Design a protein around this ligand. Structure first.
Ligand code: WEP
Lengths: 105, 90, 128, 148
């Protein structure tokens, strides 16, 4: 069962799909292919919760009904920074303008 | 496999090239006798993240014999999203 | 007894003609809204019981009524007042509920037109 | 007219099934090609209907006239029931283009008299005002049938 994700770190967002039976490690391998950092230099997160490499995405709480193509689930990414991992930091996107009055109920 | 689409505010969006080809404009920009990166000086990140979500939705649900869900658009992003869809031709 | 009878009269020299602001509202607002409704099409003309193969239609329905007759009546100043016109819309709906089985697709269309009709009629101006 | 029902009088049971998040307006094209809307179906509901062989149907969003799909196409014509089995008409949302989906959302929030008060380009005003409708779609489906 496919889960649609946004792997985010700072101002980087990876859009990728994966199975519920696929592991957190398999997702780190996707990240290494794109962002050229090895799995041991990555930390994956669901909210502020660090995910274990051997856990399947489904075991982590990522379900098909909650990780849809049109509304993907967010997986936080933190890279190694010398002898310590950097603090998880996802930069938010820009803000839309104030809703025009001709669009208000 | 992937392309980087950079919003006007510097956010990077890495999507499958096949998905980004959902845009007729991106498909033409990447066409011709490759370019793995596209900047959009006029599309902000709140709009470009939503366009990327639509790419995933279009590829997943096009030609599928499973019922299609609605692509959701909040009122706050609707006008800017409309302007981006019109430019991107998707 | 199949052949359709002559349609209802829409003009009579011996019946008093009349125009009020309520009868103008019933034509320009009520009838116009209902005539353009997506479910107006089975009610714009007298039921062609012959072509439609409707058994005992004119045997069961003694006072046939349709929106074409009401429209022509409104246009000819046939009615004395709004209530005379409203009675004709009610008869058109009641005819449908009597002849057809509760739950049929025609009965659902009549129920949507009637719900709309009552809403419009709820804003009938006071006669001035 | 090319797009019309055939007056067959050969009964055919059909199952209209609304598998879209919209309220469906089933539209029957009569013997003269005219669209004759039938009672609506709320999202996730279905109903058996007494229809006929050769009868032509299309499905629309009851409130906005957005086009819907039936059996992954635009039109539906039932065949004769093989062994009493009904014919299924599965109605779903199409994968609209992002621009048509955005026009749908703006139309749902803005009254048509306020379209020209939106801070969008001039050509987007003409697109908002070009509301989807059965007559517009019937001409296109007729022009495709002539080619094919
Ligand atoms: C008989 C029965 N046995 C056992 S189960 C059963 C049964 C039959 C139908 C249905 C509902 N399945 C349908 O509807 C289907 C769906 C789609 O395939 C169309 N189709 C039909 O059946 C059509 N048949 C046929 O092609 C076979 C017969 C061909 C007749 C050729 C001549 C037809 C002239 C066409 C123009 N004229 C209309 O279109 C029209 C239909 C209509 C009323 C008024 C008009 C205008 S007019 C000529 O009178 O000026 C009508 C009005 N009023 C006030 C009533 O009270 C009625 N009571 C019954 C009817 C009416 C018949 N009717 C109608 N009925 C149901 C509707 F939902 C909508 C309707 F408009 C029509 C719409 C014509 C009935 C359910 C059960």
């Amino acid at each position: 069962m496919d889960v649609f994700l946004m792997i985010r770190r700072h101002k980087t967002t990876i859009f990728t799909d994966a199975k519920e039976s696929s592991t957190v490690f398999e997702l780190k391998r996707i990240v290494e292919g794109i962002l050229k950092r090895p799995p041991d230099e990555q930390r994956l997160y669901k909210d502020d919760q660090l995910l274990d490499d051997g856990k399947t995405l489904g075991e982590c709480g990522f379900t098909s009904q909650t990780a849809r193509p049109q509304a993907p689930a967010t997986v936080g990414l933190a890279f190694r920074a010398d002898d310590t991992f950097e603090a998880l930091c996802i930069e938010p996107f820009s803000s839309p303008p104030e809703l025009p009055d001709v669009m208000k109920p | 496999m992937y392309v980087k689409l950079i919003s006007s505010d510097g956010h990077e969006f890495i999507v499958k090239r096949e998905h980004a080809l959902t845009s007729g404009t991106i498909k033409a920009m990447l066409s011709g006798p490759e370019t793995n990166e596209v900047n959009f000086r006029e599309i902000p990140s709140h709009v470009l993240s939503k366009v990327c979500m639509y790419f995933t939705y279009k590829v997943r649900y096009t030609n599928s014999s499973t019922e299609i869900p609605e692509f959701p658009i909040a009122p706050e992003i609707a006008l800017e999203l409309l302007m981006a869809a019109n430019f991107l031709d998707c | 007894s199949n052949a359709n009878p002559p349609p209802p009269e829409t003009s009579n020299p011996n019946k008093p003609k009349r125009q009020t602001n309520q009868l103008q509202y019933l034509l320009r607002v009520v009838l116009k809204t209902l005539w353009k409704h997506q479910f107006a099409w089975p009610f714009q003309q007298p039921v062609d019981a012959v072509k439609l193969n409707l058994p005992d239609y004119y045997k069961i329905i003694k006072t046939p009524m349709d929106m074409g007759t009401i429209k022509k009546r409104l246009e000819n100043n046939y009615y004395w007042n709004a209530q005379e016109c409203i009675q004709d819309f009610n008869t058109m709906f009641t005819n449908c509920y009597i002849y057809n089985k509760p739950g049929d697709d025609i009965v659902l269309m009549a129920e949507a037109l009637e719900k709309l009709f009552l809403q419009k009629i709820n804003e009938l101006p006071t006669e001035e | 007219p090319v797009l019309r029902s055939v007056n067959s009088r050969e009964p055919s049971q059909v199952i209209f099934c609304n598998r879209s998040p919209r309220v469906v307006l089933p539209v029957w094209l009569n013997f003269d090609g005219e669209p004759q809307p039938y009672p609506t179906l709320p999202p996730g509901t279905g109903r058996r209907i007494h229809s006929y062989r050769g009868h032509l149907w299309l499905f629309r969003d009851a409130g906005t006239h957005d086009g819907l799909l039936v059996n992954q196409t635009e039109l539906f014509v039932p065949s004769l029931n093989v062994d009493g089995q009904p014919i299924f008409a599965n109605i779903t949302l199409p994968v609209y283009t992002l621009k048509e989906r955005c026009l749908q959302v703006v139309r749902s929030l803005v009254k048509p008299e306020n379209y020209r008060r939106l801070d969008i380009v001039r050509s987007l005003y003409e697109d908002l005002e070009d509301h989807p409708n059965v007559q517009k779609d019937l001409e296109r489906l007729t022009q495709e049938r002539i080619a094919h």
